[PDB]
Design a protein around this ligand. Structure first.
Ligand SMILES: [K+]
Ligand SMILES: [K+]
Ligand SMILES: [K+]
Ligand SMILES: [K+]
Ligand SMILES: [K+]
Ligand SMILES: [K+]
Ligand SMILES: [K+]
Ligand SMILES: [Mg+2]
Ligand SMILES: [Mg+2]
Ligand SMILES: [Mg+2]
Ligand SMILES: [Mg+2]
Ligand SMILES: [Mg+2]
Ligand SMILES: [Mg+2]
Ligand SMILES: [Mg+2]
Ligand SMILES: [Mg+2]
Ligand SMILES: [Mg+2]
Ligand SMILES: [Mg+2]
Ligand SMILES: [Mg+2]
Ligand SMILES: [Mg+2]
Ligand SMILES: [Mg+2]
Ligand SMILES: [Mg+2]
Ligand SMILES: [Mg+2]
Ligand SMILES: [Mg+2]
Ligand SMILES: [Mg+2]
Ligand SMILES: [Mg+2]
Ligand SMILES: [Mg+2]
Ligand SMILES: [Mg+2]
Ligand SMILES: [Mg+2]
Ligand SMILES: [Mg+2]
Ligand SMILES: [Mg+2]
Ligand SMILES: [Mg+2]
Ligand SMILES: [Mg+2]
Ligand SMILES: [Mg+2]
Ligand SMILES: [Mg+2]
Lengths: 116, 177, 136, 78, 51
RNA sequence: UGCCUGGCGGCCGUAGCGCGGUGGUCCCACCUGACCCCAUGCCGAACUCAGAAGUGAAACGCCGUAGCGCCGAUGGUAGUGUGGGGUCUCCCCAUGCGAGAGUAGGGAACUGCCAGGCA
RNA sequence: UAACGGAGGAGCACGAAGGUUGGCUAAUCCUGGUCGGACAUCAGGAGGUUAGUGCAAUGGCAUAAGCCAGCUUGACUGCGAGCGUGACGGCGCGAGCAGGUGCGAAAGCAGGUCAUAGUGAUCCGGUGGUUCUGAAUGGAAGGGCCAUCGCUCAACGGAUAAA
RNA sequence: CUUACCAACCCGAUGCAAACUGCGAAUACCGGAGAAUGUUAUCACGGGAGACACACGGCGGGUGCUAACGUCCGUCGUGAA
RNA sequence: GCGGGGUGGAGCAGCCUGGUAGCUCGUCGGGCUUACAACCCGAAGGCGUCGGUUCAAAUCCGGCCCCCGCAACCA
RNA sequence: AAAGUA
């Protein structure tokens, strides 16, 4: 099963981040959409979030499942984070390769101000 | 790609009627075709494998993958990790073109051919057949062989039972007996 | 003579023999010979009692042996001093606690089972008693 | 005759060194073990021989956590 | 004990050396690694030599 | 506010299997292509990218159902600390602690944060 | 925690079998398949670690510590809060600090290897280094200090170089 | 076709284990808190030693034959004194 | 008790250290001879007994059996 | 040079 294979791929880095007490930037990617969440160190409270299933973000995009949508979510989640004064996070690729859409989201969040 | 069009424009409705599937994604598909050469003679002369792969490359138009022994076996004098085979996995367009070259050219050139068995199904709708001589494939010049070679052919199908797998292969006129 | 076909280890600590038995019901036949005392049953004893039992019922019915001699017993040979390692395995025993059903019988009348079990008990080093199957 | 046995190795003094609720300084060994019978929790490290040691001052705490019902040792800051 | 001791000599000309072992029958090629030379306080190339 | 879905957690079988049913606006999945970024010790299978015609078939979610797993008393029994006793290889008495197994029974999880769809 | 109690192993291996990043998941059986057989390679299914671990056994291991690949030398140098274990000599675990390094986009990880055997005090000397010493003085010899080498001293806390 | 037949696997039922464990005590041990009691009974450093042949009895065991006023450990008691 | 053994019909190599095992004689067929022997040609024929380890054992390991050689002592 | 027997 594809989802269980990815969850296995993601566990080692997630357990490391929990041990370090880091604030996580979690990314989730589907064929049609991409999602970003900034999660508190306890792992059970979401501080900010942005995705292509939101109207205000998806209205400005031709298609929600490409690198351009990824860059828009990356920038959006960073501005909302800095507005709450968060700044310092750790990137959690959630078992996806650091590449393509996932990388384009990360690059946009770095550019917009998030330190990782 | 011709046989692929044959599948989508005529085989689906034939099977949609014969088995009364409600969804079209229920229709059996041809997932992949895998060719295998068990070259157990390479442990004495590794160059024998280099020719067997050369044939499989010509027959399929794809670089073959040398396969290794999963464990040491005393009965065949092989240690774990010995290269003793070669295989090729065909999917998509290259699959269908080989599927066409096989039914309409290579199979009618079989020694004393009298139809393929219809009991060579594994129980979950996949078909396996053995070719005794590699000369049946026109990409093999009968004059440049150094040794006659067979192979196995497996057609892996997304069917659920043996009856649906034979129905799918029949719709392409698989030369059964 | 019963004896394990193979074992993990050749020799075994002496141990002790406290407690009451497990397996105190007639479970396979209708009549049983139950241990009242505590002790060891050698393989020769188990077999001597089996023979006496079996000849008394004229090899009719069925007989179960509920105990198996799985404990090896070592002995030091004569004129050997103390030390120099554990002795050699000489025979096999089963440890018996009070309540242990040792044999069971079926397919014969109760009067004959009583007589056959009496002849067998005379071969055994432990006090025994005749029991019958109970519904609960 | 003689025996073919008679050998043994020195005892290794493994086991729990600081029990639940004990106050420890950073660096203190909590348990010595072969392999991870106990796993490292918060503020606890796992050495190369799988020794669990305190990474901060505080109180030892044992707990069972996770999907495998594994035993974890952590240090509660005091 | 077939493995033999060898020394890895700094290429920085300081005379500093590390020591290790080597199976000279299976790997006769000279061992070469970049290691920290504490005399010049840099990582440099170190080359196998006799013990 | 209620319903449905996605993500991250708590918890770690009363929560897992099996069997039966059921869902596609959205979401999810399969899916459609691949010159490309990237990829196959062969294969666009997987990873990846560009997409949105089709289908909920598989998967997943939800609902149902004790065929299982799992949980589980009360009482008794085993063991045992202290003191005393006997016929002392083993037990008994006073007092304190008191299982395991089994029985009745329970049981088709519960829950926090954020987001989207619908009413 | 003893016995001339019950059972097995060591006196190594490895410049990758070490570091790191990314990926992966076992045994066994059943069915179908050229030569091909009980057992080779192929395909599907059941199964769920019954495999695997450089070598005994135990404790571990899926976030794998098991399998594959890319790049590499942290198998770094100086130190070390604190702790374990020893009569002692000693032996072990260790965050963190300075310098310099590898892998990773990054958080990070790396001071050898899943861990626990693979060993030998002191003396006497050998080799290289050295801002130390240098018997009137300048040198030198010799000595010190740092790195390293020589023992089945195995009766393994090692009476002698030699029974 | 047939078995004097043998039957592995799986299913059901019954036992056994120092080097078996999907369960699991009593005690013992480590740590914290509190009262009462006890001539500090605790720890550290320093002056002086003796001792390093133990014995039997109870309980838990290895060995021996659940032999020994036997032998070897653990723990308590007394003898030693 | 410590050693060493056990392999074609006989006597004996190989074992050590894992990957089908030899030699002499004997036997069988043919030839030479009036016939036999001698001689010549050609062929055939097998790891004491289990267990274990191992992908694989004549071989390594641990039992058991049969043989051999030393030792089984001081009062 | 080597040729035994009935
Ligand atoms: K199929
Ligand atoms: K359930
Ligand atoms: K490596
Ligand atoms: K590597
Ligand atoms: K002078
Ligand atoms: K000595
Ligand atoms: K005692
Ligand atoms: Mg006991
Ligand atoms: Mg030990
Ligand atoms: Mg796809
Ligand atoms: Mg469905
Ligand atoms: Mg209970
Ligand atoms: Mg259910
Ligand atoms: Mg003591
Ligand atoms: Mg002692
Ligand atoms: Mg990794
Ligand atoms: Mg590794
Ligand atoms: Mg390793
Ligand atoms: Mg190791
Ligand atoms: Mg001298
Ligand atoms: Mg000098
Ligand atoms: Mg001078
Ligand atoms: Mg000594
Ligand atoms: Mg206390
Ligand atoms: Mg003494
Ligand atoms: Mg003494
Ligand atoms: Mg004593
Ligand atoms: Mg006693
Ligand atoms: Mg005793
Ligand atoms: Mg005595
Ligand atoms: Mg006694
Ligand atoms: Mg005295
Ligand atoms: Mg004569
Ligand atoms: Mg004559």
């Amino acid at each position: 099963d594809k989802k269980s294979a990815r969850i296995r791929r993601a566990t080692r880095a997630r357990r490391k981040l929990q041990e370090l007490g880091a604030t996580r930037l979690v990314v989730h990617r589907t064929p049609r959409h991409i999602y970003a969440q900034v999660i508190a160190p306890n792992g059970s409270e979401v501080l900010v979030a942005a995705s292509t299933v939101e109207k205000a973000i998806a209205e400005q995009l031709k298609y929600t499942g490409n690198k351009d949508a990824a860059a828009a979510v990356g920038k959006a989640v960073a501005e909302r984070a800095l507005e709450k004064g968060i700044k310092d996070v750790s990137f959690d690729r959630s078992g996806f390769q650091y590449h393509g859409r996932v990388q384009a989201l990360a690059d946009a969040a770095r550019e917009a101000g998030l330190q990782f | 790609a011709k046989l692929h069009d044959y599948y989508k424009d005529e085989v689906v409705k034939k099977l949609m009627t014969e088995f009364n599937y409600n969804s079209v994604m229920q229709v059996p598909r041809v997932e992949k075709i895998t060719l295998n050469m068990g070259v157990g003679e390479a442990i004495a002369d590794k160059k024998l494998l280099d020719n067997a792969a050369a044939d499989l490359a010509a027959i399929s138009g794809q670089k073959p993958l040398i396969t290794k022994a999963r464990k040491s076996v005393a009965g065949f004098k092989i240690r774990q990790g010995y290269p003793i085979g070669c295989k090729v996995t065909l999917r998509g367009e290259r699959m269908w073109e080989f599927f066409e070259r096989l039914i309409t050219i290579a199979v009618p050139r079989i020694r004393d051919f009298r139809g393929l068995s219809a009991k060579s199904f594994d129980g979950r709708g996949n078909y396996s057949m053995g070719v005794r001589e590699q000369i049946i494939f026109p990409e093999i010049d009968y004059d440049k062989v150094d040794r006659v070679r067979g192979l196995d052919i497996t057609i892996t199908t997304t069917a659920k039972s043996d009856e649906e797998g034979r129905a799918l292969l029949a719709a392409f006129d698989f030369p059964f007996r | 003579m019963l004896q394990p076909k193979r074992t993990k280890f050749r020799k075994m600590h002496k141990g002790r023999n406290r407690g009451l038995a497990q397996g105190t019901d007639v479970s396979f036949g209708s009549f049983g010979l139950k241990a009242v005392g505590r002790g060891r049953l050698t393989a020769r004893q188990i077999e001597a009692a089996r023979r006496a039992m079996t000849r008394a019922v004229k090899r009719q019915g069925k007989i179960w042996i509920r105990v198996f001699p799985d404990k090896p017993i070592t002995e030091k040979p004569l004129a050997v001093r103390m030390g120099k390692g554990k002795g050699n395995v000489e025979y096999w025993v089963a440890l018996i606690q009070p309540g242990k059903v040792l044999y069971e019988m079926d397919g014969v009348p109760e009067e004959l089972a009583r007589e056959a079990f009496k002849l067998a008990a005379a071969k055994l080093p432990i006090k025994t008693t005749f029991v019958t199957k109970t519904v609960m | 005759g003689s025996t073919r046995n008679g050998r043994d190795s020195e005892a290794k003094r493994l086991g729990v060194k600081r029990f639940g609720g004990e106050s420890v300084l950073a660096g203190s060994i909590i348990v010595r073990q072969r392999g991870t019978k106990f796993h490292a929790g918060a503020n606890v490290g796992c050495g190369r021989d799988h020794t669990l040691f305190a990474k901060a001052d505080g109180k030892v705490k044992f707990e069972v956590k996770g999907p495998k019902n594994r035993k974890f040792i952590s240090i509660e800051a005091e | 004990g077939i493995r033999e001791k060898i020394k890895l000599v700094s290429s920085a000309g300081t005379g500093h050396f590390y020591t290790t072992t080597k199976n000279k029958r299976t790997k006769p090629e000279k061992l070469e690694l970049k290691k920290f030379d504490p005399v010049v306080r840099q990582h440099v190339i170190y080359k196998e030599a006799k013990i």
